[PDB]
Amino acid sequence: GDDIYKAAVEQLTEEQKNEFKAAFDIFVLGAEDGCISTKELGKVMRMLGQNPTPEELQEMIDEVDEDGSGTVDFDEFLVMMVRCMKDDSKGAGAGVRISADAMMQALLGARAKESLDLRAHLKQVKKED
Template structure:
């Protein structure tokens, strides 16, 4: 489905894409397939996303690849993703802290690289064994076989 492809390209949830599609369509009354940057700004405001006019201009320039001055649906999704996904970063930090605590059962302040492999596999089942080993080697530079919270955070947010 096109929504599935959009989800992969933008990192948005399918539900978010459905909501954004409805918003886009309700403003694209003549079904031209695009809306104006001003309209985009209105939609973001309705979604409770605050954006300064300077950064908005920059983002529009970046996203309006064909320079048409009109924002097509795929461009609109990329733009919305920038805001929606940044909002999620704080929530992600919290989740990572909880995940780390969950796996650091003894409260040592570190987890083993074996445990980290399991976490990574749960987060992304597509990772191959080689990729996992590569990631672990990158993080566990001193070869200690353990990863502390800072190393864990750096990896997850890097």
């Protein structure tokens, strides 16, 4: 719920949205109305190999809960993913920081890992001086 996120998602185009559109399909695996609830949200996040807290499941949605329905949609999730990208970069943040690049392999598959390994590099120093 910040400008840094809304500003990022705003830049995203159909090309990028398309990738997310397919993700939701798997993310809502089991859901009745193809929605992302806390029940599944916890399995999808833990599927990557994490053991976060139960409260986080709700807090995560609360952040993107505008309609106050209690579920994350394609539009809501759009903002969530934006935060993910700016979650690992921060560094030092609890023992579970979901990432858009990491979660990808979860939906796309294991091949996604071998396909791209940019995360491994991790570098960003302009060095002005």
